[PDB]
């Protein structure tokens, strides 16, 4: 209780390394598939077989090139991506297709747990977004963050087949819930997704 109202300085940060799933700070990654029936038989906006992902972040330093100790204050924030046009509250957090010949009502999602509980889905523009939470042991002097992907759609009764390819964009931030309160951009990175249906026509 008390302290930290005068005689303090909390951050000075300039840059970091980020690495997605065994790539660099820019990453392509193949998505988890569905069967011809599993896509139409999945329920509207429900959970299914995700894919599990990690961001390694290192060399976290000042504008002066000096590397630091802030390994509990750090966390990922999602800035944007190829998001769903005309989305409603249930459909918020959804990634649309770049394939013109691909699937229509089928999207990707961002979430914290995903495998039985996808309903904790994440939106880039929303202040309710949780930051991903770093493991200081999993990197030499920085920390490692965790996230997931799965499907969603409003209408399985209107679902199409093919491919669905997309992307999301991120930044690294300081102490506070996502971008909430005072902040500084510690780093950032870029991840591209590549999904499809099995045995396609």
Swiss-Prot record:
Organism domain of life: Bacteria
GO cellular component: pilus
Disulfide bridge positions per record: 16-60
Subcellular localization: Fimbrium
Keywords: Disulfide bond, Fimbrium, Signal
Gene Ontology annotations of biological process type: cell adhesion involved in single-species biofilm formation
Main localization, broad class: other
Protein family membership: Belongs to the fimbrial protein family.
Protein name per Swiss-Prot or TrEMBL: Fimbrial subunit type 3
Species of origin: Klebsiella pneumoniae
Gene: mrkA
């Amino acid at each position: 209780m008390g302290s930290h109202h005068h005689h303090h300085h909390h951050h000075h940060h300039g840059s970091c390394t980020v690495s997605v799933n065994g790539q660099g700070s820019d990453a392509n990654v193949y998505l988890s598939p569905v069967t011809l029936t599993e896509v139409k038989a999945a329920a509207a906006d429900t959970y299914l077989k995700p894919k599990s992902f990690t961001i390694d972040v290192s060399n976290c330093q000042a504008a002066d090139g000096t590397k630091q100790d802030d390994v509990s204050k750090l966390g990922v924030n999602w800035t944007g991506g190829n998001l769903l046009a005309g989305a409603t509250s249930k459909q918020q957090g959804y990634l649309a297709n770049t394939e013109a010949s691909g699937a229509q009502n089928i999207q990707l999602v961002l979430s914290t747990d995903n495998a039985t509980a996808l309903t904790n889905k994440i939106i880039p523009g929303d202040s309710t977004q949780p930051k991903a939470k770093g493991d200081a042991s999993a990197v030499a002097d920085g920390a490692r963050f965790t996230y997931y992907v799965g499907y969603a759609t409003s209408a399985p009764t209107t679902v199409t087949t093919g491919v669905v390819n997309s992307y999301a964009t991120y930044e690294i931030t300081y102490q506070g819930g996502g971008g909430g309160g005072a902040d500084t951009t510690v780093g950032g990175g870029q991840v591209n997704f590549f999904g499809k249906v099995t045995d396609v026509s």
